[PDB]
Point group: D2
């Protein structure tokens, strides 16, 4: 699993379940083309987005639909969504864990990169 | 001053100076059109991006060029940049302050609406 | 104003108003003795805690009563309070700004030393 | 495992390894008595701090020795350590995961509480 996403809820102190995640890869013409998508599980995690064969070097954008998540809880959020943009595998294959911590008017995202 | 940005450096414990910031507004055709831009001052703040007359309801994207900032310090960052996308409501008197806290492999952004 | 505190509310997107803050200085016998205290203003800031004459080198603890703040809003928080423990260096002109961002089950604190 | 601690390094994008953690429980006389301690593993995690039998209701303080960690990397940190103080098991046994994200002049801590 070369690309994993984990989302936590800072208001309830629990994993953010059923959060939609869309991943994009920047194409030759500087356009963001769909790459993979999914929803976080009961543990707030999303695995199996891609394979090492398909996850080649490039610039990727991970979009986390935070807005839908908060509205489903009756809270009015500030952000439309949380975005994480990074260059990946620029120097060989790496395993990426994108973690996000969510609050209505704030979020933090961290990346853990391992071999 | 309806829209203000503040950027801090969590590695050095100081404001992030001379960080380039680009703001975009989503156009009718779902395209991001340039709206305003600038660089943070010595206090890590960026004021005067727009006026209340120009800052109408809409979806905005604030892009903080974090990558250039870290490279200028000899550190290899993870993110290409930090992005904040939000809808400017305009329901009563409201000033938007977008704060960002930067680290090489992490960042947090918070919105203060007063 | 060598020591300033700023508290923000990540749930409401506003400054955390009327939050009690207690500062302690570690004494010779490794005991925490009261040093200063106050409540954040409408801007979520607390100024005038001490003077440069009184703020000498030492280990300080800034305690933010986050629990009372959340309960006053009808939310059950996780933490009893947020604590920031640091050594005031005093190596050249330096002002300390302790910023805290609050959520019911999480908080982040950052120090800006300018 | 009722009490688990996870520490990440926001500067290197990796788990914070070998970070010392001390847990205290507030005693009757309002004194902090040692409860458990350990060091984070290669994954930045610390398990087996206590058992459900021993982890009774009370106020606990989790101290993470962030200062030693940063100095061992040649960086001068701001904080002496990161502290997390909370009431636990006040309404029956719960599983607590204390997560901390570290930077030289900043840190964030989040709690995930499950049954």
């Amino acid at each position: 699993c070369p690309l994993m996403v984990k989302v936590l809820d800072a208001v309830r102190g629990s994993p953010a379940i059923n959060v939609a995640v869309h991943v994009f890869r920047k194409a030759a013409d500087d356009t963001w083309e769909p790459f993979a998508s999914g929803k976080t599980s009961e543990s707030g995690e999303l695995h199996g987005l891609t394979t090492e064969e398909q996850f080649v070097e490039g610039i990727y954008k991970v979009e986390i639909d935070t807005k839908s998540y908060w509205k489903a809880l009756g809270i009015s959020p500030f952000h439309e969504h949380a975005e994480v943009v990074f260059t990946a595998n620029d120097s060989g294959p790496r395993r990426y864990t994108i973690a996000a911590l969510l609050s209505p008017y704030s979020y933090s995202t961290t990346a853990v990169v391992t071999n």
